A = this chain, B = another copy of it.
């Protein structure tokens, strides 16, 4: 449950995404929930850290550029957590990156259309989350080591 304070432009950069099965989402650092499936090339900046079972936190750009075989954390619609491997490693070309600074000092850098999960369980575009001043789901009880 964290709100997005600011949104600042970070330039055009090569951006990335991953695909998984199940609920088509994966956990970022500290428990935010990004979507893992889309028609449009929704993407995240290179440095965006993803929590993995094997190696801990890794930047998605490293996971994709090196096609690292690893397992990420997902959430169901009940709210309970589970693991599943990365299935697709997406290089989404050059797109405009925007830096969303959260109320808690966290940074999410991504395309405006990348969907993230609100507290209610809605998968809404990050830019829509920011302007409607909605709360980002932040999952607790992820492993911390």
Contact = CB atoms under 8 A, between A and B. Distances in A.
A contact face: mostly helix, strand, loop, or mixed = loop
A80 B50 CA distance: 32
A25 interface: yes
What is the count of identical protomers in the complex?
A: 2
Interface stretch (A8-16, A38-46, A54-62, A63-71): A38-46
A31 interface: no
* Interface band, chain A: 10 to 19
A67 to B, nearest CB: 16
Interface of A: 19, 21, 23-25, 35, 37-41, 77, 88, 117, 121-123
Question: Across chains A and B, which 8 residue pairs bring their CB atoms closest together, nearest first?
Answer: A37-B37, A39-B123, A24-B37, A23-B39, A24-B39, A25-B39, A40-B77, A41-B77
